[PDB]
Amino acid sequence: EAHIQMKAAALKSAQSRLFGLDGGISTQEENTERHTTEDVSPSMHTLLGVKNM
C-alpha cells in the first residue's frame, strides 16, 4: 500500500503524449518558377492585361 501510494503521488496526472513536433519542417511548396532578364520584377514576368489609361 505504501509503494502504491508513493507511485500514485509521484506520477500525479502526467499526461502521456504519443508524438512530439513533427520533423518535417518545410510546410510550403518548392518554387520551380524560372527567373529571366526579361521579367518586370523578381515576382512577376509580364504585366499582360494592364492598360495605362
Place this chain on the structure above:
Amino acid sequence: EAHIQMKAAALKSAQSRLFGLDGGISTQEENTERHTTEDVSPSMHTLLGVKNM
C-alpha cells in the same frame, strides 16, 4: 494501571499519518514549444483559419 492510563490520556486520539506533502512540486508539463520572430504572439504562431469578413 496508572502508567497505562497516563499513556492513554497523553496519546488521546492522535491519528497517525504515513505521508506528508509530496516533494514533487511541478504539476504541469514542460513547454518544449519554440518561439520565433515570425510569431503573431508569444502564445501563438499563426492565425491560420481566421477570416476577416
